[PDB]
Design a protein around this ligand. Sequence first.
Ligand SMILES: Cc1cc2nc3c(=O)[nH]c(=O)nc-3n(C[C@H](O)[C@H](O)[C@H](O)COP(=O)(O)OP(=O)(O)OC[C@H]3O[C@@H](n4cnc5c(N)ncnc54)[C@H](O)[C@@H]3O)c2cc1C
Length: 537
Amino acid sequence: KSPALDAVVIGAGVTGIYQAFLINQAGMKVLGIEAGEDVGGTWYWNRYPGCRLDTESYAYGYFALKGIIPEWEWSENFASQPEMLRYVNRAADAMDVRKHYRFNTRVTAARYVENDRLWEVTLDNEEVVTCRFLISATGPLSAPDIKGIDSFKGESFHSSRWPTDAEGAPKGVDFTGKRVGVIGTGATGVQIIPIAAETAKELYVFQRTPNWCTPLGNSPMSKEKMDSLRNRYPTILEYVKSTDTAFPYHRDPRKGTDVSESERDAFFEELYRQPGYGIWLSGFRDLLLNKESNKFLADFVAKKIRQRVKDPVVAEKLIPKDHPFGAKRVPMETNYYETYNRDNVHLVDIREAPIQEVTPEGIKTADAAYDLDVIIYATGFDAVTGSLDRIDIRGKDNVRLIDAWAEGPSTYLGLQARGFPNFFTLVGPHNGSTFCNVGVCGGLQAEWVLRMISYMKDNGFTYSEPTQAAENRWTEEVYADFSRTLLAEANAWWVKTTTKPDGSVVRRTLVHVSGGPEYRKRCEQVAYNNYNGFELA
Ligand SMILES: Cc1cc2nc3c(=O)[nH]c(=O)nc-3n(C[C@H](O)[C@H](O)[C@H](O)COP(=O)(O)OP(=O)(O)OC[C@H]3O[C@@H](n4cnc5c(N)ncnc54)[C@H](O)[C@@H]3O)c2cc1C
């Protein structure tokens, strides 16, 4: 039996729609599947107030850099979610990609059929479609275990499904007269909190531990700036393809320990005040390698927080004590810290007073009862464990992907796993999503996968799977790269350590941290050498 499709692509975010576009442009048959009503992924799902890029719009805008929608005009240096959604909609118009997709459809299971070298893909546990290759673009992030949520009698908002009007704007964003509680001070919370505080009668921020945040420095984009950027796109593209993260930044050549205190302070002050991520990405070369260097920057950011927040007790609570700066994807913010100088804003330390439950009346901590009218659940993400866990994926000998990866992801090139032929995982933490400009990283990744599938078609190969040796060597190489950074000591659970039935010890990181260009170079050496390390038939 032969599959009906060359490929199924799961997800209609930026990654998935471009993979689908590429496959179709190449003359192959592709079906996209998407749970939502339309395209956008992130930019479709996340509708909460303050939702905005951390990457310069022009640098994230790969579909414009690549000449798919080159006329696109950005209105701001760091585009808001509604603009991002318009960009993805326009890109999808230009790629004519919607016709290849099933919308409002969840892939519930995928099983590899060994006799027939194809995937049976189950849609909403009913229809089954067959394809030669299965490609996940289910998103680099996934996603509250609090007693009593269902009992609250006021309004509940969840940042991941913020209610919208018929025009797609967020409902109930005016909190005039309302006592509001926000739980969470990750990326979403720090975008939500300063906006909610503008109208709430009282705002309580329930925070377990603070993250490092830096100011975004967003501003409108002039027509003149937009035109000069567009004229520079061929250069901008070459640049972002050459940096380690694919953001438009590269590390300072110097070690922080080599620079005087006075020079360090001046350098940091300039970068802190420059819009975007430079404070981190343009920082000293040893910032994520060396504790002293890291501490220089963390101390500087801490000093900036103390400047910006009036009450020294409150300030201290907002400054991380227990983790290096940049050990997580750093939230950027617009007047977040100054929000706490407002008289109607209160920080509730729930490490010291954990939440016992949500009640009909509001929130109960170990120490106090907060009567609220509104609760906003500003829930975090896992940028670490990946988005495939909700799909029943079965490879050879009916093995679960979740079991195969129990001791940590095991892949070759971060793209296929032994046991799961003709299955490609785009854009996930195990291949670099966590610290990438995903607009660019993911687009380049989809192009490599296109080239592999085309090669297979040209040669009449219908089977691909990593060897055990190549998968093992890769996975050890990725771990060793990870193990030389401060991430390893700071995020201990990002590493899975397993002593084998005999005595030897296996270590795998959940998160690939290797430089983009080095990673892509290794992928091309493999592709050039007839996909050496993949068995093909
Ligand atoms: C608030 C926020 C701000 C961000 N800002 C930036 C930024 O500035 N720069 C940056 O590089 N990254 C940023 N990110 C990361 C973001 O994940 C990527 O930029 C990008 O949107 C990921 O695109 P994707 O297509 O790979 O996955 P997604 O955009 O997550 O799309 C995945 C799609 O797959 C669908 N799906 C999942 N499972 C199934 C299933 N089983 N069946 C059918 N459909 C399924 C989902 O519905 C979704 O539509 C941000 C993320 C968030 C949440």
